[model samples]
Target chain A: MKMVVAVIRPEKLECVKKALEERGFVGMTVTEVKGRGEQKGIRLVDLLQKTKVEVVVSDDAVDEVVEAIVSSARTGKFGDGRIFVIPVEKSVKIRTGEEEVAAA
Target chain B: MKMVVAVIRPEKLECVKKALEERGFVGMTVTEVKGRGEQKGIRLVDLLQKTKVEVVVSDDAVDEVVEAIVSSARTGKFGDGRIFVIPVEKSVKIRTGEEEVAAA
Candidate 1:
């Protein structure tokens, strides 16, 4: 399985949310993140919040998921955010038997 | 490096957070998320609040990191949550060039 991690502008949460739902991948986690950047020994803390959207999908569906993410989260401007494609070993569900969910 | 994502019980945030900090892997993000499970037409909408804790740590530290999560987040019962480990292709930060902040 793959966990498509997209860090994007906070304002695009709904856009991305709708985009994902439209694609039939409604299972996701959304986060308001405080990202830090260090340059020339200076810490550039995020003054504005950034939204992190994570969705785990089947191998073949990853492309479409990322595509939906790109178009929805883009504003044709800087600070558009980054997308990190992380590899997921297993998808475990709490209180539920681990076999019930594998990013299902 | 790996992103150790734990979809855990909301009440265990503090327990997990402290466990992480004590290990010097303080950089992480927390989110309030609603998740759905649909398997064999089993639409289990987790009505209980779930906390998604994400920590990106070095490969060397992943074992300890996850171990900390399991210990702190576990209640020896169901609904304890899940842990998803994903691969990081690159850690891209906004406003920083591609060469910078690759999860350094």
Candidate 2:
């Protein structure tokens, strides 16, 4: 499995979630995060609140997931945030005690 | 090491934290999040708030940690939320400048 972590504009969250759901992906965790990124030649923080979306998915689903996020969250602007793909050695469903791919 | 990302009911946050702390897992990051899950056939967005708890733990401790979280957070309902485990290629503690397993 792969973990997709994306930091994006706050206002675009609903759209991004909708896009992912449309593609049959649900169950994501969202967090309000302060982002530091290029700001058109200034080191100042963006100040504008941003949201982080995290989803753990099967390896085969990563490409589609990333594409959905980029297209939904992109504003063709800086601080549109970034998407990170990390290797997931394991996963578990707390309720069912499912492990690995089954858990995801 | 693994990163356990759990989405849980907001009201259960305190218990979850306390449970993990009892197991010697004190460092974690908590964030507010909205969750969409099986809501008894309503797609009304649930409206209720949720919390996302993130903890990076050594591989040997994952099962115990997951048990603590599930036992603390479960409400035996549809929106009780979910837990995901992801592989951490690396982890870094910015302040102390620790890396990999030590960082976690």
Which predicted model would earn the best DockQ?
2
Per-model DockQ: 0.32, 0.54
True contacts kept of each: 0.61, 0.58
**Structural similarity to truth (TM-score) of each candidate:** 0.58, 0.80
Q: What TM-score would chain A of each candidate receive against the reference chain A?
A: 0.80, 0.88
Question: At residue A80, what lDDT does model 2 achieve?
Answer: 87
- Comparing chain B with the reference, what is the TM-score for each candidate? 0.78, 0.86
Candidate 1 lDDT over residue span A1-104, tens digit each = 77788888888988888898788887777667756333345444445678777787777889999999999999887678778876676565544434222444
Error of 1 at B25 (Å): 13
Cα lDDT of model 2 by residue, B1-104, tens digit: 88888888889999999999999999999988776653346454533578889998888898898899999998776777777776676888799998875343
lDDT of 1 at B68: 82
Model 1: per-residue Cα lDDT over B19-97, one tens digit each: 9899887889987975543334544332356798888766677678877888788886756767787655566655775
DockQ of candidate 1, scored on C-alphas against the true complex (2 decimals): 0.32
lDDT (Cα, 0-100) at A32 in candidate 1: 71
CA error at residue A32 for candidate 2, angstroms? 1.9
Residue-pair clash count for candidate 1? 5
